[PDB]
Amino acid sequence: VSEQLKCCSGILKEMFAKKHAAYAWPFYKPVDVEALGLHDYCDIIKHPMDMSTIKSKLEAREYRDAQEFGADVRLMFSNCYKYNPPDHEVVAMARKLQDVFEMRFAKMPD
């Protein structure tokens, strides 16, 4: 792939690293609406996204560029902020993981 898209795989790998796991784990897989009892989630969140889905898209070379990858990562976090109250524990986790992502995504070379 492009160099920028290789860097994106490295960013996602970092988001999967154990040092971040205590706040990243909710985002590892698709929100399991049945397991969680969330009867309004699919209505509120029209475009679900998670880290495993992003990884699959990287592996299948489905992103046209780094901005498309970044849009999916931000969609994942935005969905969390949209669905949940701002004081929710999962929102705090999203913000900590988004801090990891934004710092690395910003420091990508041009």
From Swiss-Prot:
Post-translational modification summary for this protein: Phosphorylation by CK2 disrupt the intramolecular binding between the bromo domain 2 and the NPS region and promotes binding between the NPS and the BID regions, leading to activate the protein and promote binding to acetylated histones. In absence of phosphorylation, BRD4 does not localize to p53/TP53 target gene promoters, phosphorylation promoting recruitment to p53/TP53 target promoters.
Purpose: Chromatin reader protein that recognizes and binds acetylated histones and plays a key role in transmission of epigenetic memory across cell divisions and transcription regulation. Remains associated with acetylated chromatin throughout the entire cell cycle and provides epigenetic memory for postmitotic G1 gene transcription by preserving acetylated chromatin status and maintaining high-order chromatin structure. During interphase, plays a key role in regulating the transcription of signal-inducible genes by associating with the P-TEFb complex and recruiting it to promoters.
Site feature (Acetylated histone binding) residues: N84
Distribution of this protein across tissues and organs: Ubiquitously expressed.
UniProt-annotated location(s): Nucleus; Chromosome
Subunit structure: Interacts with p53/TP53; the interaction is direct. Interacts (via CTD region) with CDK9 and CCNT1, acting as an associated component of P-TEFb complex. Interacts with RELA (when acetylated at 'Lys-310'). Interacts (via NET domain) with NSD3, CHD4, BICRA and ATAD5. The interaction with BICRA bridges BRD4 to the GBAF complex. Interacts (via NET domain) with JMJD6 (via JmjC and N-terminal domains); the interaction is stronger in presence of ssRNA and recruits JMJD6 on distal enhancers. Interacts with NSD3. Interacts with NIPBL.
Occurrences of domain Bromo (ranges): 1-108
Disease: Cornelia de Lange syndrome 6: A form of Cornelia de Lange syndrome, a clinically heterogeneous developmental disorder associated with malformations affecting multiple systems. It is characterized by facial dysmorphisms, abnormal hands and feet, growth delay, cognitive retardation, hirsutism, gastroesophageal dysfunction and cardiac, ophthalmologic and genitourinary anomalies. CDLS6 inheritance is autosomal dominant. A chromosomal aberration involving BRD4 is found in a rare, aggressive, and lethal carcinoma arising in midline organs of young people. Translocation t(15;19)(q14;p13) with NUTM1 which produces a BRD4-NUTM1 fusion protein.
Domain notes: The NET domain mediates interaction with a number of chromatin proteins involved in transcription regulation (NSD3, JMJD6, CHD4, GLTSCR1 and ATAD5).
Similarity comment: family membership: Belongs to the BET family.
Additional remarks: JQ1, a thieno-triazolo-1,4-diazepine derivative, and I-BET, a benzodiazepine derivative, have been tested on tumors with success. Treatment with GSK1210151A (I-BET151, a I-BET derivative) has strong effets on mixed lineage leukemia and promotes myeloid differentiation and leukemia stem-cell depletion.
Source organism (scientific name): Homo sapiens (Human)
Origin: domain of life: Eukaryota
Protein name: Bromodomain-containing protein 4
Signal peptide location: none
